[PDB]
Every structure is written in structure tokens, then in C-alpha cells.
Write an enzyme that holds these catalytic residues in place. Structure first.
Site, mmCIF file in Angstrom:
data_model
loop_
_atom_site.group_PDB
_atom_site.id
_atom_site.type_symbol
_atom_site.label_atom_id
_atom_site.label_comp_id
_atom_site.label_asym_id
_atom_site.label_seq_id
_atom_site.Cartn_x
_atom_site.Cartn_y
_atom_site.Cartn_z
ATOM 1 N N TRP B 84 20.298 -125.809 -98.192
ATOM 2 C CA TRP B 84 19.725 -125.337 -96.939
ATOM 3 C C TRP B 84 19.995 -123.861 -96.672
ATOM 4 O O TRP B 84 19.468 -123.321 -95.693
ATOM 5 C CB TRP B 84 20.268 -126.167 -95.765
ATOM 6 C CG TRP B 84 20.127 -127.644 -95.969
ATOM 7 C CD1 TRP B 84 21.130 -128.543 -96.205
ATOM 8 C CD2 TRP B 84 18.909 -128.397 -95.961
ATOM 9 N NE1 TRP B 84 20.610 -129.808 -96.342
ATOM 10 C CE2 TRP B 84 19.249 -129.747 -96.194
ATOM 11 C CE3 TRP B 84 17.563 -128.062 -95.773
ATOM 12 C CZ2 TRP B 84 18.294 -130.759 -96.249
ATOM 13 C CZ3 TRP B 84 16.616 -129.067 -95.829
ATOM 14 C CH2 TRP B 84 16.986 -130.401 -96.064
ATOM 15 N N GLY B 120 17.775 -125.773 -86.696
ATOM 16 C CA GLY B 120 18.360 -125.620 -85.377
ATOM 17 C C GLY B 120 18.000 -124.344 -84.651
ATOM 18 O O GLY B 120 18.713 -123.957 -83.723
ATOM 19 N N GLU B 200 10.149 -130.358 -89.403
ATOM 20 C CA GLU B 200 11.295 -131.255 -89.372
ATOM 21 C C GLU B 200 12.413 -130.619 -88.553
ATOM 22 O O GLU B 200 12.642 -129.410 -88.651
ATOM 23 C CB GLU B 200 11.756 -131.577 -90.803
ATOM 24 C CG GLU B 200 12.792 -132.674 -90.908
ATOM 25 C CD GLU B 200 14.203 -132.121 -90.890
ATOM 26 O OE1 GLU B 200 15.158 -132.920 -90.785
ATOM 27 O OE2 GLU B 200 14.352 -130.881 -90.973
ATOM 28 N N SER B 201 13.081 -131.436 -87.722
ATOM 29 C CA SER B 201 14.203 -131.025 -86.855
ATOM 30 C C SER B 201 13.726 -129.957 -85.870
ATOM 31 O O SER B 201 12.855 -130.257 -85.034
ATOM 32 C CB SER B 201 15.382 -130.636 -87.751
ATOM 33 O OG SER B 201 16.591 -130.463 -87.023
ATOM 34 N N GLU B 329 20.357 -140.652 -88.585
ATOM 35 C CA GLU B 329 20.147 -139.300 -88.085
ATOM 36 C C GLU B 329 21.461 -138.598 -87.767
ATOM 37 O O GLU B 329 21.568 -137.377 -87.945
ATOM 38 C CB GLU B 329 19.258 -139.336 -86.840
ATOM 39 C CG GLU B 329 17.792 -139.649 -87.120
ATOM 40 C CD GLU B 329 17.036 -138.462 -87.706
ATOM 41 O OE1 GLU B 329 17.618 -137.359 -87.804
ATOM 42 O OE2 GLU B 329 15.855 -138.631 -88.075
ATOM 43 N N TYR B 332 25.124 -136.743 -90.716
ATOM 44 C CA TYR B 332 25.279 -135.393 -91.259
ATOM 45 C C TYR B 332 26.029 -134.476 -90.301
ATOM 46 O O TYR B 332 26.815 -133.629 -90.736
ATOM 47 C CB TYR B 332 23.898 -134.810 -91.589
ATOM 48 C CG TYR B 332 23.872 -133.328 -91.906
ATOM 49 C CD1 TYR B 332 24.013 -132.877 -93.209
ATOM 50 C CD2 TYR B 332 23.674 -132.382 -90.905
ATOM 51 C CE1 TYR B 332 23.980 -131.525 -93.508
ATOM 52 C CE2 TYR B 332 23.643 -131.029 -91.195
ATOM 53 C CZ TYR B 332 23.795 -130.607 -92.498
ATOM 54 O OH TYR B 332 23.762 -129.263 -92.800
ATOM 55 N N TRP B 434 25.782 -136.199 -100.750
ATOM 56 C CA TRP B 434 26.610 -136.585 -99.621
ATOM 57 C C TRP B 434 27.217 -137.967 -99.864
ATOM 58 O O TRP B 434 26.695 -138.749 -100.660
ATOM 59 C CB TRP B 434 25.781 -136.576 -98.338
ATOM 60 C CG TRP B 434 25.368 -135.200 -97.920
ATOM 61 C CD1 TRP B 434 24.164 -134.600 -98.151
ATOM 62 C CD2 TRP B 434 26.162 -134.242 -97.205
ATOM 63 N NE1 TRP B 434 24.155 -133.333 -97.622
ATOM 64 C CE2 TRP B 434 25.369 -133.086 -97.036
ATOM 65 C CE3 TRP B 434 27.466 -134.247 -96.694
ATOM 66 C CZ2 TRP B 434 25.836 -131.945 -96.374
ATOM 67 C CZ3 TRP B 434 27.930 -133.115 -96.038
ATOM 68 C CH2 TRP B 434 27.114 -131.978 -95.884
ATOM 69 N N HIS B 442 20.060 -137.053 -92.013
ATOM 70 C CA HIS B 442 19.055 -136.146 -91.484
ATOM 71 C C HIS B 442 18.605 -135.158 -92.552
ATOM 72 O O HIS B 442 19.427 -134.597 -93.279
ATOM 73 C CB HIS B 442 19.642 -135.401 -90.284
ATOM 74 C CG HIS B 442 18.680 -134.478 -89.611
ATOM 75 N ND1 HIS B 442 17.704 -134.922 -88.747
ATOM 76 C CD2 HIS B 442 18.545 -133.132 -89.672
ATOM 77 C CE1 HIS B 442 17.012 -133.890 -88.300
ATOM 78 N NE2 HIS B 442 17.500 -132.793 -88.850
#
Ligand SMILES: *[C@@H]1O[C@H](CO[C@@H]2O[C@@H](C)[C@@H](O)[C@@H](O)[C@@H]2O)[C@@H](O[C@@H]2O[C@H](CO)[C@@H](O)[C@H](O)[C@H]2NC(C)=O)[C@H](O)[C@H]1NC(C)=O
Ligand SMILES: *[C@@H]1O[C@H](CO[C@@H]2O[C@@H](C)[C@@H](O)[C@@H](O)[C@@H]2O)[C@@H](O[C@@H]2O[C@H](CO)[C@@H](O)[C@H](O)[C@H]2NC(C)=O)[C@H](O)[C@H]1NC(C)=O
Ligand SMILES: *[C@@H]1O[C@H](CO[C@@H]2O[C@@H](C)[C@@H](O)[C@@H](O)[C@@H]2O)[C@@H](O[C@@H]2O[C@H](CO)[C@@H](O)[C@H](O)[C@H]2NC(C)=O)[C@H](O)[C@H]1NC(C)=O
Ligand SMILES: *[C@@H]1O[C@H](CO)[C@@H](O)[C@H](O)[C@H]1NC(C)=O
Ligand SMILES: CC(C)OP(C)(=O)O
EC number: 3.1.1.7
Lengths: 528, 532
Positions: B84, B120, B200-201, B329, B332, B434, B442
Site C-alpha cells: 500500500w 483514508g 474502495e475505503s 473489515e 486490519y 497477514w 479490509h
């Protein structure tokens, strides 16, 4: 004359009667005066001990029922008439009854003391369903039951006043317990082994004697059936008690406390009864006008606070509920409900019912109830709404108060045994949708199915005999188990047993998710 | 010697692209097309200005710079976080977009998908490997567009009322890209009358904000919201709280030596970009997870009201939306601040750590509100079981920030005229790095939507390649038709039946209720509680 039926109490001589049961005879002493008649100037005042008498008191028949409201919701219906007075009403009503084995025991025999329910507004020791003959014959105990004042006569309170101090119906009970301590040995009973048991307001009464030190020395074990002193209906604050007493006086044409009570004392008893329901602050179910008052004397604090502060090591308690505590009350005011329909209510009726079954709370608190008791995948299903409002009324008023009492007592030293009564009587006259309604374990505890003139099954009689053995085992030892085992209830494991025709099944949690809402979160919400 | 397929004339001038190899065939890609003037120097915090025309040919042959942003350092070198993080240099000169089209170019107008990344509102980039549009375009023969938009303080620092830092300029970056698509996508073969936004998000929250802002709504026709909604408690901020955060950031970097807004922003503009990034997290009012410093502000302009009120008051007839969530969700986010949590252990927290985590996961609510959360998410027959507590706190954070906002938007849109399709993505990739306790975290549906398993250099199983092709077909079907079903059926989501489908390796299974019991608490009761 039969010498087994002649007893001398501290006040004088009594003449009892021999009763028949399918298991053999029983001695009964019915209608024993334990107080001076609380009449005229004695209305609303604490009871006073019965003065000694010469001659022989006739104790062969039940005495009068304390003045009370008579249910007229379904006239002639067995399901309601079985709770209505079966003797004439009178304020001269402070009598008690003693059943003992025949011949009278010659060794000290454990004593069970029954306190009837009826919302503190009704009830009588003479009801057929409280007949002590079967318990006494089967389990060889001494059984005592007393009448106590109800309604305004037992619980009208102008707090701080001396003409109407309140809680005198509980003092009537306490005087009967003192009478047992002083005289039960004359019948063969053991005053050192007295077990209190009671249902609904009777159970609330038992709990209040647990939390009032002057009563605690008068018994040794406690049974609370479908009731607890800490619910939302069993006590009232001083301010609201005064408001209700004052509104009753106005409703019957009466005007300081002295002049107010004096005018109330001039009114026929039936006149007070006819206005009793109208001092409640709103339309509701499971609320009663004149109930025990928290004024610092009989209860030095709220039952909740006394339960949390108490050291209960050395006490054993047996508590439980029926499977459907709420259903009976819904036909007395919840919209859409009746015993002669399926009572398949709509969402609108459900929402209106919540305000009736959870009265006198803020809109936010009512919203929280609706959130918890809605299935948001089936929000409008009538059958689910009917069951949900039954759950609301039963959890709020019975199950969660009992669960909190059981958990706090257990965590503070008491040995607690918990049950859920799950057998619907084959004789039940209430409709099927009500399930196992409030009050319908009593007939099994008292062994009524053993009566041949009634129509219970062979399996139900065995079931009754099982329940009588549990209850009397607990009275004798503090442990109902027959020496599948019944484990004690604890705040962590929360174990209880189901009582039905099947053997004991151990389960966890007295509606734990629902009762976390009523007992843990909702009080915080009402504070803010 | 030139290739005519790789030359396109847009309104600003001529462009040159590249021919991308894909496992299924060639794709044309135009990467790094300038759509705004660089928002540098005096243009920092200002709304974007359209790119001025140019002479000659712009080489749109590789992704441009990532917009300046915080770089995650929680697990350095860990693939689960580094995937990311920026894969290009950071720069305030970052307002570029990307176009993928079939090779050869379509001859008839082709439906357009426009991707808006999440992160975010503080991070993200259209250049991330997981957003590579070459497989979607090859598999389903659509045109794919993605844009960079400013994040962090550069995109969303707001001194409301001021014209030097009005706020929401990162959303205006997105809208300008959308205007660019309307004006230029036909030159690549795309159909400007069939444009489907998906994100997304924070990208999903952005998509929803374009649906609720009239000047944006004319630039697209369908919407896909993956694991996000504009009405979440993290996606917008009030005017006063945005001002408090901007003023605190300025204070922490020496501006002024609050006060006059022009003076304040002028001082902020002299600060190096990294200096602002270094203090970005310090302006949050409390320790939390799933809270971000600089996000869209509700100030009456881009959003004339809160997204909640706009959703409740809107007429959505003629709209098709596709919405959904991952299965876990919340998980994470717990390793970013919840006590007792780590990707390295099982994070079997205690009751005390659960209660403390509730305040971190539900920040800035009253003690009473926190008690209500504890009541609903505690199993009172097992109040202290560590595994149940871990799962419960995951549900708290996930329901509060994603599932229930999505469910509220789905239910209200459906009841007010929209055709809605809802999913729950429940496949945990074989390549996921993960830990197992996080479940399907998520963000990990994206790689399947973009068809990343078809990349030869990655080790996905053959079934996951088939799965990825299934999802690409659903998304493209919805883009072309407004209905993911191919011409087992996917029924529409409605407020009553609340039907959705599970996306995994098995065929679609229809289920009811997007955590209905939980979301009734968040969407219906808790707002009433916060009002007294
Ligand atoms: C089930 O009965 C309730 C109660 O109704 C009473 O009992 C029956 C004998 C019936 O014949 C009614 O007339 C009686 O009033 C019904 O709820 C009542 O509905 C009436 C008419 O709409 C209304 O006036 C009353 O206020 C209602 N009473 C209550 C307590 O809500 C209910 O509709 C019946 N359920 C059915 C038919 O499904
Ligand atoms: C708030 O501050 C701005 C800042 O601009 C100042 O302009 C000069 C007056 C000088 O002080 C510079 O150092 C500042 O940058 C004010 O806007 C200016 O106002 C002046 C005079 O009123 C006018 O020329 C322009 O509007 C602005 N000048 C600029 C941008 O160079 C603004 O008026 C201040 N508001 C208040 C209430 O004080
Ligand atoms: C699971 O890990 C958490 C998170 O931090 C760990 O700390 C490292 C020292 C290492 O042990 C890694 O596994 C993790 O990154 C543990 O909680 C931490 O405990 C330490 C020591 O008490 C404390 O300094 C940290 O503040 C704690 N962190 C948080 C977020 O609370 C937790 O104890 C581990 N669970 C176990 C061991 O069961
Ligand atoms: C795929 O497999 C080979 C090893 O056989 C190697 O490339 C690597 O371990 C795997 N993944 C990637 C991304 O290379
Ligand atoms: C920050 C990312 C992981 O979440 P979304 C809200 O963008």
C-alpha cells in the site's frame, strides 16, 4: 374428642380438624388469630399481638380474606377465578394456618412458611392451590401460611407520619413469623428450621425479610419463586407513595397527614378498593398501587443496595422462574392481546405495548428496549412480536430481577439453586400461546395433582412428587438434591436446571443477554 | 516510425502511450496524463486548475509521482503493508491520470470504469501494483481510468470560509479528472455516456460524495462502493473540528510566528511538504484507530449537508449501485493502536484490553455510549474468553466504520428509487501475508477485482484465477448494464429482504441482512443516545 386436634398456644386453646389425602390423614389448624383485628382506628397501623382468649378457638375452617380487588377481566374463567377470594372479604383477616402430620409429630419437624403473591394488592392463604395437606403428608413437614393485609390496608404510606407509616402488611407477615417462633413447637414443628417460601409478591416479601434484620432472626432458609424484592414493581419511593396515598384520599372525598388518615378511616373498605387502580401514574401492566415503601425503617436502603452490600455467607436460597413469565400480564392492558385470540400483534401494537410494559421511562429508554427486542430481519412478524413483548414484560419484571438477586447473593457467600419451570399443565385453561404462564408451578409444588378429584395425568403426579421432594429436601438441608444432580447457581457459570417431566437438565444463563441490558446498561442510561 | 494505436489527441494536445503485454493479449496504456496544473508553491491547498494546452507530444508512458503522503512504517519490509506504500517518488506535482484501452482501440463507444483509490484520504496512489488496470481491460474490453488526487493536508486541510485553504480540494481533483473523462474519453474509444465510478475505503466514500454533490453527479451514471461509504464516522469532519486540526497543525510547524487565515496559509505554504507530513497524526483529538486527520469537510459547498442527511433526502431513481464489504473489515485496523494486538501473535486479548480497545475503536463518544457498545458486543455467557473478545473488537471497529455505514446507504438508496446489489467478499487469498486470525481483511478483495491473479509472475492458484475472472465479469456486467448478472442469480438488495450474495470460490449464495442486529444499534439507536 380427638386429642391430636387439641393444641394450646400461648394465647389459649385451639381445636383443629382431621383432613384426608390419598396418602393418609393430616392435622390442620385453620384460622388461628395471630393479631388483634386491624379495624377502625387500627386501620393502616402496625399489627398488634392477639390478646389471650379463654375457651377453645374453632380452628376447623379458613378465616376471611383481607379486603382486596376482585379480578373481573374474565368472569367465571377458571384461570382467573382460581386466584380470586374464596372466602368473604373483611378487614378482620389476620389469621394463619398450620398443617402437620397425623398424628402430630413427637420430634421437631422442619417448618415451611408460605407467603402468597398477588402484587401486594390481592391474595389469600385459603386458595385451593395453596392447600398444604399434600406437602405435609408426602414430605412430613409442618406447613404454616398467613394472611397479611394488601392494597391500601397493608401498604398505604404517608412516610414519616405515624397514622399511616406504610409496610404494615409486611409487619403482619413478621408478626406471623414471630408467632411461629413462639408456638410452632406445640404442633411438632422445629422453630430452629424455618424455611420461607413464596411466589411473585410473596417471593418479593421473602426477599424483604432477608434484607430486614428484625426479620432475619425468624427463619433460616428462603425460596423465591418468580419474584424478587429488587424488581421495578415491588417497592416505591417515599415521594411517590405519598402522592398515591394523597390521590386516593382525594378520589374518595377526603381532604396534614393526621386529618387525611382520619378521613380515610371513616370510609368503607370497599370504597378504597374501588379507587385503588386509579392512583397509578399511567396505563401499565405489572404495576400495583400500594407496595412496600423504602423509608429507612423496614428497608434501610433500596433492596438493590442492600443486596450489593450484604454478606450472605451461611444462607442457602432456592430461586426460579416459569418459562413464560410475561404472557399472563399482557391481557391486562397491552394493545392487541386477549386470551381468546392468538394475539398476533402488529409492530404499531408492539411499540405501544412497550410503553405499557415498561412504564415511566424516557423515550430513549423505550427506544433501547425496542432495539434489544426487535429481530431486525423480521421486524414486523406478528408471532415474533407477541413473543417479544412477553419477553419484555417477563424479563423486566421477573427474570432479570431474579437473576441479579441470584448472582449477587451467590457472589457474596450464599449457596443458590436456580430453576426454570417448563411444564405446561394438562389442566391449563389459558390458551396455548401463553406457554407456561406466571404462577402455574405452584400447583405442582403443593402437590395438587395428587388430588383424585382433579384431572392430572399419572406422569404429572410423579412430577409433583419430584418437586415436593426437591423443595422439602431444601427445607431440611439447604440442598434440593436427592442424596442427575442440581448444581448451585454462580455468577460465572450461571447454572440452573429445567423442571419438567424429563429428568433434570443443567443449562447456563438466566436470559443472560437480555438481563445484561436490564441489570447493567439500562440503570446507567436512566442516570444520564 | 510511430504506432497509430499509441497516439491520441485530447483537448489539451497530443499524447503518446505504450503497448502493454497481458496474458490475454495487448493493451494500450496512457499513464501519467496531466489533468491539472501542478498544485505547488502558491497553489498548495487551492482548488485544482485545468491543465493548460501544450504543443508537441506528451509521453504518457509511465506512472507519475505519488501525491505527498505519510509512509507506513509499522512493519518495515512486510509485504502486507508495503503493498500500500508509494511505489513512485513523492511530489506535490502529482495531478495525473491513467487510461487503459483495448488494442486495437475500440471502434464503437465502450463503457468506462473510473477507479478512485482509498487510503483514508491520507495516502494512496493510482500507481500501486494492485490497481493495475491491464487485466480488467483485456478480460472485459472496457476502458479503465484512474487518477491521483491530493491527500493529507495537501488535499483536505480546511480553514472553512477562507479561499486560500477552502478544503475538499482533493475531491475537486477527482471531479476535474471526471470532467476530463467526459471531455476526452471518446478519443480513446470510451463512452462518456456510460461511466461507472468504483473505489474502495476512502475511494468508496469519495464515490458516494460524488453521488451526493450535484456538480459531480452529471459526470457518471453508476457507482460501486467497496468497503466504504460517505456517511461513516471517519469520512467527514465538521467545520469547527477541521479548523481546530488545521490550526493545530500550523501551530506545530510554527505558523503563525491561529489568527488571520491568509497569513496562516501563507506561512503553511513556506513549510517543506515532509514537515507537514511529520506532524499530521498529532492533530487528532485522541488515540484511535480508523481515524484520519484531514478528510472531507461538511461546509455547505461540495457537501451541502452531512452525507447522512443527503442520503435520507435524496431521490435516487435511475441509479444503480453495487456495494459490499469484506468478511473481516475490522481486523486490519486493530494492530494500529488497539492494546494487545499484533500481526505477529494471536492477539488473544484480555477483558481489560477489550474494554480499553472499545474507547480506541469508538473514539470521542460518551462513557454511556461506550457502555452501550460493551453491552452489545459482550457475550455475557463468555464475557472474558480471549478469542471471543478479539473477534468482538474486530466486529466493533468493522461494523462502526464500514459495515453499518454501507448497510445504511444501501438500505436508504434502495428505498428511495435506486437499484442496489450487495455482496460480502469471503475468500482469503492463498498469497495473503497477514496472520490467520485476521480472516479476510479490509482491502483484500481489490486484487481479485483487478484480476491480479492472472499475472504470471504471481503464484495464485488456478481456482483463484477463475474466481478473479468471475468477479471481473460481475463488475463489468454492472458497468455495461447496471446489473452484475450475465444476460445462480444475484438478487437486488432492498430495505426489507436485505439480500446479498457471498463472493468466494463456491457459487453465489444468497443471504439476508448486513449484520442487521449490530447495525440497528449503530444506525438506529446510538444516534438517539448521542443526542442526550
Ligand atoms: C384479539 O382480541 C383483541 C381484544 O379484543 C377483545 O376480545 C374479543 C372478544 C374481540 O371480539 C374484541 O371485540 C374485544 O375487544 C383485539 O384487540 C381489540 O380490537 C378492538 C377492535 O379493533 C378494539 O376496540 C380493542 O381496543 C382491542 N383490544 C386490545 C386489547 O387491543 C384483537 O384485534 C384480536 N385479535 C385478532 C382479531 O386477531
Ligand atoms: C487578513 O490578512 C490578509 C493578509 O494580507 C496582508 O496584506 C497586507 C495588508 C500585508 O499586511 C501583508 O503582509 C498581508 O499578507 C489581509 O488581506 C490583505 O488586505 C490588504 C489590505 O486590507 C489588501 O491589500 C488585500 O486584501 C490583502 N493583501 C494581500 C493579500 O497582500 C486581510 O485583510 C486580513 N484581514 C483582517 C481582518 O485583518
Ligand atoms: C502480542 O503483541 C502485542 C503487541 O506488541 C508486541 O510487542 C513486541 C515486544 C513483541 O512481543 C511483538 O510480539 C509485538 O509487536 C503485545 O502487547 C505488547 O506488550 C509489550 C510488553 O508488555 C508492551 O510493551 C506493548 O506496549 C504491548 N503492545 C500493545 C499494542 O499492547 C502482546 O503482549 C502480545 N500478546 C501475547 C504475547 O500474548
Ligand atoms: C512463486 O514461486 C517461485 C518459487 O517457485 C518464486 O517466484 C516465488 O516464491 C513465488 N512468488 C513470486 C511472487 O515470485
Ligand atoms: C486507510 C485505509 C486502509 O482504509 P480506507 C478508510 O481508506
Amino acid at each position: 374428642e380427638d386429642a391430636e386436634l387439641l393444641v394450646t398456644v400461648r394465647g389459649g386453646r385451639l381445636r383443629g380438624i382431621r383432613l384426608k389425602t390419598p396418602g393418609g390423614p393430616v392435622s390442620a389448624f385453620l384460622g388461628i388469630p395471630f393479631a388483634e383485628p386491624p379495624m377502625g382506628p387500627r386501620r393502616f397501623l402496625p399489627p398488634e399481638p392477639k390478646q389471650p382468649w379463654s375457651g377453645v378457638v374453632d380452628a376447623t375452617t379458613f378465616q376471611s380474606v383481607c379486603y382486596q380487588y376482585v379480578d373481573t377481566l374474565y368472569p367465571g374463567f377458571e384461570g382467573t377465578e382460581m386466584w380470586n377470594p374464596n372466602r368473604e372479604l373483611s378487614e378482620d383477616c389476620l389469621y394463619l394456618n398450620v398443617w402437620t402430620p397425623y398424628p402430630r409429630p413427637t420430634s421437631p419437624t422442619p417448618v415451611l412458611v408460605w407467603i402468597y403473591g398477588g402484587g401486594f394488592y390481592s391474595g389469600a392463604s385459603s386458595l385451593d392451590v395453596y392447600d398444604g395437606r399434600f406437602l405435609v403428608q408426602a414430605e412430613r413437614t409442618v406447613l404454616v401460611s398467613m394472611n397479611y393485609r394488601v392494597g391500601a390496608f397493608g401498604f398505604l404510606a404517608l412516610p414519616g407520619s405515624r397514622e399511616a407509616p406504610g409496610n404494615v402488611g409486611l409487619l403482619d407477615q413478621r408478626l406471623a413469623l414471630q408467632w411461629v417462633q413462639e408456638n410452632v413447637a406445640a404442633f411438632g414443628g422445629d422453630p430452629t428450621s424455618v424455611t420461607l417460601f413464596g411466589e411473585s409478591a410473596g417471593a418479593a416479601s421473602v426477599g424483604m425479610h432477608l434484607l430486614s434484620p428484625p426479620s432475619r432472626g425468624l427463619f433460616h432458609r428462603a425460596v423465591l419463586q418468580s419474584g424478587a424484592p429488587n424488581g421495578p414493581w415491588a417497592t416505591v419511593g417515599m415521594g411517590e407513595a405519598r402522592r398515591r396515598a394523597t390521590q386516593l384520599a382525594h378520589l374518595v372525598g377526603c381532604p396534614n397527614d393526621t386529618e387525611l388518615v382520619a378521613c380515610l378511616r371513616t370510609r368503607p373498605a370497599q370504597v378504597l378498593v374501588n379507587h385503588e387502580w386509579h392512583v397509578l401514574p399511567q396505563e401499565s401492566v405489572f404495576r400495583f398501587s400500594f407496595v412496600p415503601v423504602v423509608d429507612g425503617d423496614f428497608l434501610s436502603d433500596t433492596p438493590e443496595a442492600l443486596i450489593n452490600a450484604g454478606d450472605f455467607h451461611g444462607l442457602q436460597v432456592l430461586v426460579g422462574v416459569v418459562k413464560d413469565e410475561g404472557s399472563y400480564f399482557l391481557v391486562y392492558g397491552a394493545p392487541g392481546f386477549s386470551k381468546d385470540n392468538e394475539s398476533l400483534i402488529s409492530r404499531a401494537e408492539f411499540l405501544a405495548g412497550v410503553r405499557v410494559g415498561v412504564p415511566q421511562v424516557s423515550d430513549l429508554a423505550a427506544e433501547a428496549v425496542v432495539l434489544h427486542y426487535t429481530d431486525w430481519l423480521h421486524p414486523e412478524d406478528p408471532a415474533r412480536l407477541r413473543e417479544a413483548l412477553s419477553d419484555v414484560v417477563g424479563d423486566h419484571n421477573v427474570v432479570c430481577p431474579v437473576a441479579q438477586l441470584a448472582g449477587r447473593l451467590a457472589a457474596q457467600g450464599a449457596r443458590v439453586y436456580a430453576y426454570v419451570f417448563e411444564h405446561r399443565a394438562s389442566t391449563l385453561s389459558w390458551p396455548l400461546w401463553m406457554g407456561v404462564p406466571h404462577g402455574y408451578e405452584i400447583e405442582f409444588i403443593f402437590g395438587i395433582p395428587l388430588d383424585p378429584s382433579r384431572n392430572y395425568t399419572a406422569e404429572e403426579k410423579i412430577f409433583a412428587q419430584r418437586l415436593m421432594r426437591y423443595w422439602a429436601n431444601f427445607a431440611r438441608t439447604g440442598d434440593p438434591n436427592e442424596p442427575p444432580q442440581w448444581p448451585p447457581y454462580t455468577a460465572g457459570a450461571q447454572q440452573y436446571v429445567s423442571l419438567d417431566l424429563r429428568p433434570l437438565e443443567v443449562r447456563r444463563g438466566l436470559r443472560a443477554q437480555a438481563c445484561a441490558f436490564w441489570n447493567r446498561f439500562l440503570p446507567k442510561l436512566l442516570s444520564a
